[PDB]
């Protein structure tokens, strides 16, 4: 509940055989504040790789089945996930992307960790890596949220990342399945932020995408933003 942690628990960042130590500590039987303190000590004084392993093994299944149980995130769990975000690279390669090819990510987890994305400034290079590794993977109802919010981060986009994203939109030519209003929201944020970085072939490419995949409400905004774009 509260009070000082034992000093035998604050040495695990410097301890070698961490796997059996965490296993005998029974990772499934923790409370919220103890997990928050564990993420604090494993994101403050720790290195990248075994912190990433911690993020894979313990934190991600716990937050997943907790939001399955309660349809919300606990306060200490939210603080723990923010403290996991304090180390960018381990968090991306350990929490976000593993949840991305997990395939069973729901909308609630996606919007929660996207809110966690938006609440803190991240490095541009890790964000570009996230966009590349999320554009190379298949489309669902959850990865688009990270697309939309990390385009709303409005960073200096590398152009290979732009080629990967437009290559995904090349991947959507002739599919008939009705992609939601959130798809057009992601396209709206993309053409609102990076209309000044698009070449002409990108312009007519998204134009014929608009022709092939229409939208009764937001597609006039996409036509307006494409026709009012200053070339790079």
């Amino acid at each position: 509940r509260s009070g000082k942690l034992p000093k035998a628990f604050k040495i695990i960042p410097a301890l070698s055989n961490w796997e059996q130590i965490l296993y005998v500590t029974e990772p499934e039987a923790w409370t919220a504040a103890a997990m928050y303190q564990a993420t604090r000590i494993f994101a403050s004084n720790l290195k990248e790789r075994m912190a990433q392993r911690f993020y894979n093994l313990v934190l991600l299944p716990r937050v997943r089945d907790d939001v399955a149980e309660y349809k919300r995130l606990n306060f200490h769990l939210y603080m723990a996930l923010k403290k996991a975000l304090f180390k960018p690279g381990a968090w991306f390669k350990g929490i976000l992307i593993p949840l991305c090819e997990s395939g069973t990510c729901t909308l609630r987890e996606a919007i929660i960790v996207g809110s966690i994305i938006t609440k803190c400034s991240i490095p541009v290079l890790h964000s570009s890596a996230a966009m590349l590794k999320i554009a190379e993977m298949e489309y669902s109802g959850a990865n688009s949220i990270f697309l939309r919010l990390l385009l709303d981060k409005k960073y200096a986009l590398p152009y290979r990342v732009l080629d990967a994203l437009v290559f995904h939109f090349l991947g959507f030519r002739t599919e008939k399945r009705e992609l939601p209003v959130l798809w057009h929201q992601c396209l709206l944020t993309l053409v609102q932020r990076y209309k000044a970085d698009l070449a002409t072939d990108q312009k007519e490419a998204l134009l014929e995408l608009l022709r092939l995949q229409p939208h009764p409400q937001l597609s006039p905004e996409i036509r307006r933003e494409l026709q009012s774009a200053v070339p790079r």
């Binding site: 035998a8 390669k93 590349l132 080629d163 070449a199």
Partner: protein, 59 residues
């Protein structure tokens, strides 16, 4: 990768992604041994109304 590319206008940085896709004790015994009467309405009766009268002009 793709086939449609930059073609113009000043690529700044070189987009390092090679570390992302291809990524995937005496102190012990020492801490082990360390383990073991007025209000706003009544006060209005205090104010008088007979001191600073302006001088009256009669008809």
């Amino acid at each position: 990768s793709s086939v449609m590319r930059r073609n113009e206008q000043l690529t700044l940085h070189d987009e390092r992604f090679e570390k992302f896709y291809e990524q995937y004790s005496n102190r012990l015994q020492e801490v082990l041994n360390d383990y073991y009467k007025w209000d706003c309405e009544s006060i209005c009766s205090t104010y008088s109304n007979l001191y600073n009268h302006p001088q009256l002009i009669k008809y």
